[PDB]
Amino acid sequence: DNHLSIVTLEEAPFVIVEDIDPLTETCVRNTVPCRKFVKINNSTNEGMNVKKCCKGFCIDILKKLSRTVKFTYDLYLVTNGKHGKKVNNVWNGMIGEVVYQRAVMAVGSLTINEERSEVVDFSVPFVETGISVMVSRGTQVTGLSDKKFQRPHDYSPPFRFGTVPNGSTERNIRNNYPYMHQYMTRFNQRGVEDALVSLKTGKLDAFIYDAAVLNYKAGRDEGCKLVTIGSGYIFATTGYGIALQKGSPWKRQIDLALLQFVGDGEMEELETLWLTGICH
Amino acid sequence: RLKIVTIHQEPFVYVKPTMSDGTCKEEFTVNGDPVKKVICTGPTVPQCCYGFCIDLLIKLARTMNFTYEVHLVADGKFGTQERVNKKEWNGMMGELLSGQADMIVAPLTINNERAQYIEFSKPFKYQGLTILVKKGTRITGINDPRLRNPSDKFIYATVKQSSVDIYFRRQVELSTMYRHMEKHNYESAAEAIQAVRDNKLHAFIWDSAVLEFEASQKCDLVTTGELFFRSGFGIGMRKDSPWKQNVSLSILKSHENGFMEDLDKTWVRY
Ligand SMILES: N[C@H](Cc1cc(C(=O)O)nn1-c1ccc(Br)cc1)C(=O)O
């Protein structure tokens, strides 16, 4: 049919996961049903499907696509991996659900890159991203390619800057700037929200990460003390897109629909609803 | 042998006279890197072409094992659809669709109207729309009173038969802006920028990737700073083209490679 298995992943404000409304058995308001497979323990593959409710910027996209392209969907959240990483030539995350045909599309904060694009089709990008830099207001940085990151010990004192390891940001820096990568491991942050506090409290001078996430965090930071660089200095510019199975019959109409949403203002309204914050 | 159509649009495509023996002057950037030049025919002698898009074309050619000849679009336009009943695209869009060109390598905006008819690559450049004025002129940006309810006092415009003209023609709440602009649009970006320096035109609404470069080198001119709409440039190919998939894979690889960043350094930033 035109009934589709669709995988997503929790990452506010793009996908926000909530327990089913208390508990009239139904998803209300903003939200759509999404099921999650929850393991009984870590010594087993056994689990139970748990009914949850999903909302957010990407869910609002999914809803508009569903109505325009005319399809229905069963939405579920991915249980092994995050976005998609190739482990020993084998994909986990959302990308894995698509390539192995448990899902025919993937909707979420899924960054378009070359490696993924060899095994899945990607819609046009519907939000811009890349590798950005966040600092406390006052600090002077152009972006990732600044000499101040590339040769840290040409400055005294050297800048304290890092990222969250094991994702695309670390992998990209390792391939392009090997000494930078060697240098900043000592500053690994274990999550976005710890990096923010290390920035606001002076333990870190710069945080390097996904531009779309950093812009969201900066726009809502209490005190408006954290700033990112201008989008002209974003490195490896790309976008979130919707992944489809290779050769999918939905790609052309999903693409035209997203371009219609961008061109006619609807995407802008979604950005104001979910992504724009009180700062700047 | 792919027939590439492009258009004059600094810093993406520079167009300069050949030398006497029909070769291109050898040249280097102030940072010591070769400026790669290709011969390009057009409105009809050979000329030298180079810039951001030319480096992209050269990079794509070596990566995908094809050769090319480059010409400038005849009517000097980007491409909109017009009534003839039949419809037809003018500009580079029309040339791509009639087979006069196999591929558009230009700062060609990706939008829904064009993508109905051709295949775009993933974007090779992300940018937006902004407003160039001559310093002295002062406006809020896109919501300034002089823009939201025009008169002949303050004349603003864009390029005719461009993605920007479509953008204003299609949206019901830009209807008064559009009526003012259609009677004043220009035939090219350069002519519109020259008309801003000469005070015959008071605001030019165009691609930020072009307008910021113009402002940073022509310091009588300034942009507002805002982007009021975001859009990307893509490679244009016909619906069938076997180059579609590998072209966009190469664009993606070049963003992750730092290559596009080097192009941005060399040509786009000041
Ligand atoms: N959307 C996530 C990726 C996102 C999280 C990761 C991270 O955890 O480091 N970094 N990015 C990121 C986004 C764009 C670019 Br270019 C480089 C890194 C994804 O799809 O993997």
Swiss-Prot record, chain A:
Impact of mutating residue 209 to F/L/M?
A: Strongly decreased sensitivity to glutamate
**Topology: which residues are Extracellular?**
140-280
Task: State where L-glutamate binds.
Answer: 109, 111, 116, 168-169, 210
Please list the residues annotated as glycosylated.
Answer: 41-42, 166
Query: Which effect does the record note for changing residue 14 to A?
Result: Decreased sensitivity to glutamate
Impact upon substituting residue 213 to A:
Decreased sensitivity to glutamate
> Which cysteines bridge via disulfide bonds?
27-53, 34-54, 224-279
Please state where this protein is localized. Cell projection, Dendritic spine; Cell membrane; Synapse; Postsynaptic cell membrane
Tissue specificity here reads: Detected in brain cortex, olfactory bulb, hippocampus including the dentate gyrus, striatum, thalamus, superior colliculus, inferior colliculus, midbrain and cerebellum (at protein level). Detected in brain cortex, hypothalamus and cerebellum.
Give the family this protein belongs to, as stated in its UniProt record.
Answer: Belongs to the glutamate-gated ion channel (TC 1.A.10.1) family. NR2A/GRIN2A subfamily.
The record describes the protein's role as: Component of N-methyl-D-aspartate (NMDA) receptors (NMDARs) that function as heterotetrameric, ligand-gated cation channels with high calcium permeability and voltage-dependent block by Mg(2+). NMDARs participate in synaptic plasticity for learning and memory formation by contributing to the slow phase of excitatory postsynaptic current, long-term synaptic potentiation, and learning.
**Record text on subunit structure and interactions:** Heterotetramer. Forms heterotetrameric channels composed of two GluN1/zeta subunits (GRIN1), and two identical GluN2/epsilon subunits (GRIN2A, GRIN2B, GRIN2C or GRIN2D) or GluN3 subunits (GRIN3A or GRIN3B) (in vitro). Can also form heterotetrameric channels that contain at least two GluN1 subunits and at least two different GluN2 subunits (or a combination of one GluN2 and one GluN3 subunits) (in vitro). In vivo, the subunit composition may depend on the expression levels of the different subunits. Found in a complex with GRIN1, GRIN3A and PPP2CB. Found in a complex with GRIN1 and GRIN3B.
Q: What is known of its domains?
A: Contains an N-terminal domain, a ligand-binding domain and a transmembrane domain. Agonist binding to the extracellular ligand-binding domains triggers channel gating.
Q: What is this protein called?
A: Glutamate receptor ionotropic, NMDA 2A
Species this chain originates from = Rattus norvegicus
Parent-record interval covered: 403 to 801 of 1464
Swiss-Prot record, chain B:
Residues that bind glycine: 107, 109, 114, 163, 207
> Which residue positions carry a glycan here?
65, 149, 246
| GO BP term (any one) | response to amine
Q: What main location does UniProt list? A: membrane
Q: What is the reported tissue distribution?
A: Detected throughout the brain, in brain cortex, cerebellum, thalamus and olfactory bulb.
- Cellular component GO terms, alphabetically? cell surface; cytoplasm; dendrite; dendrite membrane; dendritic branch; dendritic spine; endoplasmic reticulum; endoplasmic reticulum membrane
Q: Which family is this protein grouped under?
A: Belongs to the glutamate-gated ion channel (TC 1.A.10.1) family. NR1/GRIN1 subfamily.
Shown stretch of the complete protein: 397 to 795 of 938
**Domain note:** A hydrophobic region that gives rise to the prediction of a transmembrane span does not cross the membrane, but is part of a discontinuously helical region that dips into the membrane and is probably part of the pore and of the selectivity filter. The extracellular N-terminal domain (ATD) is a site of allosteric regulation to modulate overall receptor function.
Subcellular location(s) per record: Cell membrane; Postsynaptic cell membrane; Synaptic cell membrane; Postsynaptic density membrane
Q: Which organism is it from?
A: Rattus norvegicus (Rat)
State the UniProt keywords alphabetically: Calcium, Cell membrane, Disulfide bond, Glycoprotein, Ion channel, Ion transport, Ligand-gated ion channel, Magnesium, Membrane, Metal-binding, Phosphoprotein, Postsynaptic cell membrane, Receptor, Signal, Synapse, Transmembrane, Transmembrane helix, Transport, Zinc
Q: Could you identify this protein by its name? A: Glutamate receptor ionotropic, NMDA 1
